[PDB]
């Protein structure tokens, strides 16, 4: 009659064995089966590499003359509850769900025998909404809040104001061109202090909600700079709370991580996925691509249009740094000749900045782009790409910024001609006096030329690297270089900005067809013909840009992010479902 | 001389219709693959155009980069012969 | 119902006299394009592997610079 408890920690004598993690036995059992599944998928099995480099041909070509809308089985799972998932009618989906760590797909019989291939489910949130419902994840987040004694600095109010910010149809598209011209540089941002100090002030007076939340670099700069009574106080307190949330959440995650190391390196890169540096943020303005090649023991391969770049010594052949804009003054016309006399298709040169040396080790923008933003705003933004030449022709072929005898502190909206900057500034209704538009145009001396998308393929961790197939120990991830992720578009906005922005549905959180159909009139026909594709989980995306099986965030994350109520519990649940399924992840989960 | 039949199942006899002697064809998937692969074939033809031109540009480029060393070598051999 | 032609060995293909003589020629036309694209990327990596040789030779000649 002793009341013995059975914790999780006493089950680690079986839950941490490698035999639970090798799918080689179950792939031997599946591939020797005398009758495999007839319904094969062939939508997002393998990321094919593009030959060209510009992504506008990939997006436009992908949606041009398309009438086939197939969906993957992982998206087929998380659309129905538990009670009918185990029904005998859904045996075709139940046939392959036979391991929690492995969503085994069959592929195609394009060769001789179609082989059941196993890709490892990385984090715990990749379990389907059948076998792990969403309320269970929010309650695990509430366990995470009390297990680490997290102090949420955000209330409901900041979450709802960023929520209806990202549901504003009349979001100012001029903020996109400000974000595009600055694009995450400190010395460029100090040129635009009276620009953005007027921008977010007049947005706070026109609509009450805050702006510029669609990029980490802008809100980080607003946390660093502009606290000197530039913006109104209640607008700045939202940005200060948002930046306090990421450092508080990272402190909670390392309280989960614990003070134990393996070898000499921390265990924090094994237990979580946000603390893993090998996960990369989905938008990179500065260089991090040379940075993780110096810090990773697992070998990554940053595939830039079937160019490998697997070693750190060949850095300037694939990526050049623009540095600061002062040393570039000898090569301004050289960079312009590279712009106008360069073949940008089949150009495998990345135009980035230097790696900034912060102490955070790149975890804060991963948190902001992965657990903060797609839950306070229910996965309803897409990653667009700018053409820098067209916005450069916009901001300098106007009246007053060209003449330089038009004085500085006059309004620009009464003497600018009927260009596209006039209808850009009319639908937004801010009054940037000329001169703050002058250095805005003068940033073009070291802006990039195009927003390339690149598929970094980092190997798994050594705990979960037990698949026999050496092509599926890698979990790829696309990262949209130099372009900004952005919210929904008005049709008034899209008609005047079709010559400025093109949408790239690249990520599971950041490829969404409600926003993509606004700023792209190709998917606007595609979801007109296939309205079931309007869900974020079943949306088709280019497999040369986004391989859903070979991705860190799979479709159950998109199912949870689309239907979570934006609040504290949703944020804690999303950051609690980025825990990996490693044996030491089970150890650090059993400890707390 | 053929003959047309809906169905059968599972013979030992080699020339006998079945479900196992039925070829698993899908006209829609193959046509899309064809239409897309045709587009890929079309894009394959027009990469072999102007490597002659880029070769001429790299030839004149190495010419003007040999120009700097042909400039510098004689000036470096002049400045050390004044030691007499 | 859907009708399937039963397998007999007198079942002929749909008659193809004109099919192959242009097909092999356009095949070799695409084949030469494939081959000189592969030869182009071969020569690109071949010039990038030889270029570091002359730079390593120049950095070896930079030894004699340091004592002059």
């Amino acid at each position: 009659n002793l009341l013995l408890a059975f914790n999780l920690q006493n089950a680690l004598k079986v839950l941490c064995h490698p035999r639970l993690h090798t799918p080689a036995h179950t792939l031997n059992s599946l591939n020797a089966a005398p009758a495999p599944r007839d319904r094969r998928e062939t939508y997002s099995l393998q990321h094919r590499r593009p030959n060209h480099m510009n992504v506008l041909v990939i997006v436009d070509e992908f949606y041009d003359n398309k009438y086939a809308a197939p969906v993957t089985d992982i998206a087929l799972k998380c659309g129905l509850p538990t009670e009918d998932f185990l029904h005998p009618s859904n045996y075709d989906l139940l046939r392959l769900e036979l391991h929690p760590l492995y969503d085994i797909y069959i592929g195609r019989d394009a060769g001789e025998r179609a082989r059941h291939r196993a890709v490892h489910r990385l984090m715990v949130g990749n379990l389907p909404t059948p076998l792990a419902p969403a309320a269970f994840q929010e309650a695990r987040g509430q366990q995470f809040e009390t297990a680490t004694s997290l102090a949420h600095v955000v209330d409901q109010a900041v979450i709802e104001t960023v929520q209806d910010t990202a549901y504003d149809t009349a979001y100012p598209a001029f903020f996109y061109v400000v974000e595009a011209m600055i694009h995450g540089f400190e010395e460029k941002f100090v040129m635009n202090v009276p620009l953005v100090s007027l921008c977010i002030n007049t947005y706070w007076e026109r609509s009450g909600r805050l702006a510029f939340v669609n990029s980490f670099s802008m809100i980080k700069f607003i946390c660093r700079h502009l606290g000197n009574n530039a913006i109104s106080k209640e607008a700045y307190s939202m940005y200060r709370k948002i930046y306090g949330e990421l450092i508080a959440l990272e402190q909670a995650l390392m309280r989960l991580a614990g003070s134990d190391v393996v070898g000499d390196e921390s265990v924090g890169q094994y237990v979580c996925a946000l603390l893993d540096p090998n996960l990369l943020p989905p938008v990179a303005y500065t260089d991090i691509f040379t940075h993780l090649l110096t810090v990773s023991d697992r070998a990554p391969q940053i595939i830039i249009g079937n160019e490998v770049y697997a070693d750190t010594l060949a850095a300037p052949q694939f990526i050049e740094r623009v540095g600061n804009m002062d040393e570039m003054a000898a090569q301004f016309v050289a960079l312009y000749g590279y712009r106008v006399n360069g073949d940008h298709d089949h150009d495998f040169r990345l135009h980035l900045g230097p790696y900034v040396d912060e102490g955070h080790a790149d975890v804060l923008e991963k948190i902001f782009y992965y657990v903060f933003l797609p839950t306070c705003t229910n996965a309803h933004m897409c990653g667009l790409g700018v053409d820098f030449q067209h916005v450069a022709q916009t901001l300098a072929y106007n009246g007053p910024a060209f003449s330089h005898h038009f004085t500085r502190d006059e309004d620009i909206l009464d003497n600018l001609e009927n260009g596209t900057l006039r209808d850009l500034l009319e639908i937004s209704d801010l009054r940037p006096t000329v001169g703050m538009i002058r250095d805005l145009s003068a940033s073009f001396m070291t802006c990039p030329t195009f927003t390339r998308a690149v598929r970094v393929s980092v190997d798994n961790d050594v705990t979960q690297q037990l698949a026999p197939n050496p092509a599926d120990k890698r979990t790829e991830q696309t990262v949209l270089v130099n372009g900004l992720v952005a919210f929904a578009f008005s049709e008034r906005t899209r008609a005047v900005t079709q010559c400025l922005f093109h949408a790239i549905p690249f990520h599971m959180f950041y490829g969404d067809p409600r926003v993509a159909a606004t700023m792209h009139q190709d998917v606007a026909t595609f979801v007109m013909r296939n309205p079931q594709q309007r869900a974020v989980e079943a949306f088709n995306r280019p497999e040369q840009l986004f391989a859903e099986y070979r991705e860190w965030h799979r479709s159950p994350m998109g199912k949870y992010a689309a239907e979570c109520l934006p609040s504290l519990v949703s944020i804690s649940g999303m950051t609690a479902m980025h825990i990996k399924m490693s044996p030491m992840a089970y150890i650090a989960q059993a400890k707390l | 001389d053929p003959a047309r039949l809906p169905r059968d199942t599972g013979p030992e006899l080699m020339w006998a219709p079945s479900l196992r002697n039925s070829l698993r064809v899908s006209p829609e998937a193959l046509e899309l693959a064809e239409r897309e692969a045709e587009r890929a074939r079309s894009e394959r033809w027009d990469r072999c155009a102007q490597v002659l031109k880029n070769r001429l540009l790299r030839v004149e480029l190495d010419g003007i980069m040999r120009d700097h060393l042909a400039r510098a070598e004689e000036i470096r051999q002049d400045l050390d012969a004044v030691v007499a | 119902p859907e009708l399937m032609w039963a397998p007999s060995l007198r079942n002929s293909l749909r008659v193809s006299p004109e099919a192959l003589e242009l097909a092999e020629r356009e095949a070799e036309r695409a084949r030469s394009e494939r081959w000189d694209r592969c030869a182009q990327v071969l020569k690109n990596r071949l010039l990038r592997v030889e270029l570091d040789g002359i730079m390593r030779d120049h950095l070896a000649r930079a030894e004699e610079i340091r004592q002059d």
Binding site: P316, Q317, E320, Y338, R349 | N54, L57, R58, L61, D62, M65, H68, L69, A72, R76, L79, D80, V82 | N44, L47, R48, L51, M55, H58, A62, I65, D68
Partner: peptide, 29 residues
């Protein structure tokens, strides 16, 4: 003895520069 310094700094400036020219070559292709 003043010739053995300016000449040396200028040939160091050109031996960095010829590497910059081959770097511009790698920038081309």
């Amino acid at each position: 003895r003043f010739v053995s310094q300016l000449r040396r700094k200028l040939e160091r400036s050109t031996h960095r520069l010829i590497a910059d020219l081959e770097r511009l070559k790698f920038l081309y292709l």
